[PDB]
Write an enzyme that holds these catalytic residues in place. Structure first.
Site, PDB file in Angstrom:
ATOM      1  N   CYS A  64       3.981   0.835   9.774  1.00  0.00           N
ATOM      2  CA  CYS A  64       3.844  -0.193   8.745  1.00  0.00           C
ATOM      3  C   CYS A  64       5.194  -0.595   8.170  1.00  0.00           C
ATOM      4  O   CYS A  64       6.083   0.239   7.980  1.00  0.00           O
ATOM      5  CB  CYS A  64       2.924   0.299   7.632  1.00  0.00           C
ATOM      6  SG  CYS A  64       1.203   0.264   8.121  1.00  0.00           S
TER       7      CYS A  64
ATOM      8  N   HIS B 185       0.804  -1.217   0.000  1.00  0.00           N
ATOM      9  CA  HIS B 185       0.000   0.000   0.000  1.00  0.00           C
ATOM     10  C   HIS B 185       0.842   1.273   0.000  1.00  0.00           C
ATOM     11  O   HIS B 185       0.282   2.357  -0.144  1.00  0.00           O
ATOM     12  CB  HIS B 185      -0.985  -0.001   1.178  1.00  0.00           C
ATOM     13  CG  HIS B 185      -0.352   0.171   2.523  1.00  0.00           C
ATOM     14  ND1 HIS B 185      -0.206  -0.872   3.410  1.00  0.00           N
ATOM     15  CD2 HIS B 185       0.131   1.268   3.151  1.00  0.00           C
ATOM     16  CE1 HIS B 185       0.357  -0.429   4.519  1.00  0.00           C
ATOM     17  NE2 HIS B 185       0.572   0.866   4.387  1.00  0.00           N
TER      18      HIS B 185
ATOM     19  N   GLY C  92       3.123   5.490  10.881  1.00  0.00           N
ATOM     20  CA  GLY C  92       4.416   5.256  10.273  1.00  0.00           C
ATOM     21  C   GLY C  92       5.079   3.956  10.658  1.00  0.00           C
ATOM     22  O   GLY C  92       6.244   3.747  10.313  1.00  0.00           O
TER      23      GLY C  92
HETATM   24  C1  LIG Z   1       0.683   1.894   8.555  1.00  0.00           C
HETATM   25  O1  LIG Z   1       1.699   2.610   9.205  1.00  0.00           O
HETATM   26  C2  LIG Z   1       0.268   2.610   7.253  1.00  0.00           C
HETATM   27  O2  LIG Z   1       1.270   2.524   6.230  1.00  0.00           O
HETATM   28  C3  LIG Z   1      -0.562   1.892   9.479  1.00  0.00           C
HETATM   29  C4  LIG Z   1      -0.467   1.205  10.812  1.00  0.00           C
HETATM   30  C5  LIG Z   1      -0.550   2.118  12.042  1.00  0.00           C
HETATM   31  C6  LIG Z   1      -1.516   3.309  12.142  1.00  0.00           C
HETATM   32  C7  LIG Z   1      -1.551   3.564  13.668  1.00  0.00           C
HETATM   33  N1  LIG Z   1      -1.434   2.197  14.188  1.00  0.00           N
HETATM   34  C8  LIG Z   1      -0.882   1.301  13.308  1.00  0.00           C
HETATM   35  O3  LIG Z   1      -0.700   0.110  13.494  1.00  0.00           O
HETATM   36  N2  LIG Z   1      -1.634   1.230   8.726  1.00  0.00           N
HETATM   37  C9  LIG Z   1      -2.815   1.774   8.395  1.00  0.00           C
HETATM   38  O4  LIG Z   1      -3.088   2.938   8.710  1.00  0.00           O
HETATM   39  C10 LIG Z   1      -3.757   0.806   7.569  1.00  0.00           C
HETATM   40  C11 LIG Z   1      -3.457   1.223   6.098  1.00  0.00           C
HETATM   41  C12 LIG Z   1      -3.828   0.293   4.934  1.00  0.00           C
HETATM   42  C13 LIG Z   1      -5.186   0.693   4.325  1.00  0.00           C
HETATM   43  C14 LIG Z   1      -3.783  -1.195   5.270  1.00  0.00           C
HETATM   44  N3  LIG Z   1      -5.131   0.987   7.974  1.00  0.00           N
HETATM   45  C15 LIG Z   1      -5.508   0.810   9.263  1.00  0.00           C
HETATM   46  O5  LIG Z   1      -4.710   0.518  10.150  1.00  0.00           O
HETATM   47  C16 LIG Z   1      -6.935   1.053   9.561  1.00  0.00           C
HETATM   48  C17 LIG Z   1      -7.972   1.597   8.824  1.00  0.00           C
HETATM   49  C18 LIG Z   1      -9.095   1.688   9.701  1.00  0.00           C
HETATM   50  C19 LIG Z   1     -10.437   2.095   9.530  1.00  0.00           C
HETATM   51  O6  LIG Z   1     -10.778   2.486   8.274  1.00  0.00           O
HETATM   52  C20 LIG Z   1     -11.153   3.802   8.099  1.00  0.00           C
HETATM   53  C21 LIG Z   1     -11.293   2.062  10.621  1.00  0.00           C
HETATM   54  C22 LIG Z   1     -10.831   1.623  11.882  1.00  0.00           C
HETATM   55  C23 LIG Z   1      -9.527   1.214  12.090  1.00  0.00           C
HETATM   56  C24 LIG Z   1      -8.669   1.254  10.980  1.00  0.00           C
HETATM   57  N4  LIG Z   1      -7.344   0.917  10.872  1.00  0.00           N
END
Ligand SMILES: *[C@@](O)(CO)[C@H](C[C@H]1CCNC1=O)NC(=O)[C@H](CC(C)C)NC(=O)c1cc2c(OC)cccc2[nH]1
Ligand SMILES: *[C@@](O)(CO)[C@H](C[C@H]1CCNC1=O)NC(=O)[C@@H](CC(C)C)NC(=O)c1cc2c(OC)cccc2[nH]1
Lengths: 305, 303
Positions: free
Chosen positions: A145, A41, A143
């Site tokens: 991920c 992503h 950050g």
């Molecule tokens: C990565 O750092 C992004 O590159 C991040 C993980 C971080 C954010 C704070 N805590 C962590 O573990 N990952 C994300 O933000 C992922 C991104 C991609 C689409 C996989 N999404 C989520 O963690 C996410 C989306 C959510 C949502 O949708 C709107 C609702 C509720 C929880 C949620 N979490």
């Protein structure tokens, strides 16, 4: 003596963290030989992540759209491909700090060390267990991920986890190093819920063996049980069923204490049915389920790498 | 989000861990520049450790009596001095992996990372707090002496601990890198007790703030308290007193959650007087006191 959650020394993995950036999207990647592994992503804008078509988004990207940095040093990307949910970027430099490594897909209940990491800079290390519902109870900020989880056996680093997601409940979800999610999750910007969790039975038994090794054995009872009988009972308490692998990896602790696995199961069953009766085990009123049998060994007998 | 006992990445320290053997005694040493620091009881025999006259034993030793192995390489000792309980072995080779470092003496209630280590080989890393009775609750087995504790600020390793001892109660004791024990302990082979261990109050409050930041609020209440009246109750429970500084260090956590420090104190006072029933906080059934306010800020800022 003493019993603590203990991560593996992290130096071999620290030498492999880098930063990966597309556009303004940054995260962590894992630099091994001349390949960088990261979450696919990274190719998404914020708005792309809502409903991404990764094949379509990737078709528009070239090697020159990818910024890979070790510290402030750029590693030119010379090739790219997608494997499931992970991006693989061939770079022009073989990482001189590459350790002996493998990629493994761990089982629920197994533990690993997470090297917390931001913008390619390691920040912490801590131990985690894969829950039976395929989440981990981690500590992850924005950050994070691409941060990886690993075990070390001998001098080989076994990578088993790469971070992608935080669920609404505050637990965490990710993939193996082949890009396959643990659990029923997808890398979209959506609220997803994990199955109901359960207690990791094999680890609770490990912990009871640990207690026994330390002279704390009040809970040993006179009964035994069949494996099938125990599994049917344990599920009534939200405990995971034992596999044959679970029985096998309890062997050394069974031999060291002289307590057959099925005897210890009958002991644990009584604890479930009747409670602790105000007592503690290893000082705790809670049955601990995030020490594997190897963890018990690492800390009761001593192992090095 | 999430809260977890977290140690610093250990790579910078792993590169300094070496093995030091004298006679039939082997333990870990720390290799910085051309000096290897290790516990001085490595010069004792079984008979010696009972009551070692260390300066006497040390002068009877030669450089060649000391075998220093760094991985598959043996290091040539070209000199040896002693600073309190720490033996300083000069070697003909600077450790090329020597990080930026300083030696600090940690205060009670502060945390640090321990690189558990055997025969000059690291086995694991975990976080500890220096307790008010100057022991630490560690995980240390035979051959763990010489393992060090540290913090990392930017790219500087602050070494603060070197391991020497396990008390009969199973807790652990050691020195700073100048060889001064934390606490009233002595590097002789005797059973030694510590002073009564009190609870690190400012850390318990920080961990309660962490629990709130992470969705756990069952322990909160409408009540407040004065600083003094909170300290009256806390000392009754063998909790350290809370100072105005402590209150100030908790400001950031109070801001983020909107719970005044003295309100959290009212919650803690109720938890002490009533216990936790059958409930847990951040998965624990006990009040945790080995997280500092900064440990909590660094993990929960922005959540
Ligand atoms: C990565 O750092 C992004 O590159 C991040 C993980 C971080 C954010 C704070 N805590 C962590 O573990 N990952 C994300 O933000 C992922 C991104 C991609 C689409 C996989 N999404 C989520 O963690 C996410 C989306 C959510 C949502 O949708 C709107 C609702 C509720 C929880 C949620 N979490
Ligand atoms: C070092 O590895 C020795 O080089 C070791 C520390 C580990 C042993 C197992 N757990 C540890 O933390 N230290 C010791 O073995 C020595 C240290 C002194 C300074 C030589 N002993 C103790 O810590 C010790 C001695 C002793 C005792 O002696 C009669 C009675 C009760 C408890 C006790 N602890």
């Amino acid at each position: 003596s003493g019993f603590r959650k203990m991560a593996f020394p992290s130096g071999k993995v620290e030498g492999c963290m880098v930063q990966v950036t597309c556009g303004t999207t940054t995260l962590n990647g894992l630099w091994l030989d001349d390949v960088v592994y990261c979450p696919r992503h990274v190719i998404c804008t914020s708005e792309d992540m809502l409903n991404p078509n990764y094949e379509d988004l990737l078709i528009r990207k070239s090697n020159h759209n990818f910024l890979v940095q070790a510290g402030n040093v750029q590693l030119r990307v010379i090739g790219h491909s997608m494997q499931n949910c992970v991006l693989k970027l061939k770079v022009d430099t073989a990482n001189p700090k590459t350790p002996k490594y493998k990629f493994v897909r761990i089982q629920p209940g197994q533990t690993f060390s997470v090297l917390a990491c931001y913008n390619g800079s390691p920040s912490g290390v801590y131990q985690c267990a894969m829950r039976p519902n395929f989440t981990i109870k981690g500590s992850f900020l924005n950050g994070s991920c691409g941060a990886v989880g690993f075990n070390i056996d001998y001098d080989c680093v076994s990578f088993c986890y790469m971070h992608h997601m935080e669920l609404p409940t505050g637990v965490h979800a990710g993939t193996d190093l082949e890009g396959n999610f643990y659990g029923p999750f997808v890398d979209r910007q959506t609220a997803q819920a994990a199955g109901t969790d359960t207690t990791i039975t094999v680890n609770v038994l490990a912990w009871l063996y640990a207690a026994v090794i330390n002279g704390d054995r009040w809970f040993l009872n006179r009964f035994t049980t069949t494996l099938n009988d125990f599994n049917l009972v344990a599920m009534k308490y939200n405990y995971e069923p034992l596999t044959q692998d679970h029985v096998d990896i309890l062997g050394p602790l069974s031999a060291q204490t002289g307590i057959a696995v099925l005897d210890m199961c009958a002991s644990l069953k009584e604890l479930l049915q009747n409670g602790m009766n105000g007592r503690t085990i290893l000082g705790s009123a809670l049955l601990e389920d995030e020490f594997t049998p190897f963890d018990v060994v690492r800390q009761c007998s001593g192992v090095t790498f």
